[PDB]
Amino acid sequence: SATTPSQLLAAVHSFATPMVVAAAVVAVESTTISPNYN
């Protein structure tokens, strides 16, 4: 505690289920023009 020489676990505990990451789904909201007739 406080201030890791001694290991409390014998082996390192790995997560059973592999985490499946998903790519970003970014999209274009809108397009505006400042000087415009319409």
- Torsion from C-alpha of 29, 33, 36, 38, nearest 10 degrees: -10
Token look-up 């789904």 returns: 25
Per-residue exposure over 14-25, b if at least 16 CB sit within 10 Å of its own CB, e if not: eeeeeeeeeeee
One-letter amino acid of 3: T
Measured in angstroms, the resolution is 3.9
- Residue 1 half-sphere exposure toward CB, CA atoms < 13 A: 0
3-state secondary structure of 25: coil
Q: How was this structure determined?
A: cryo-EM
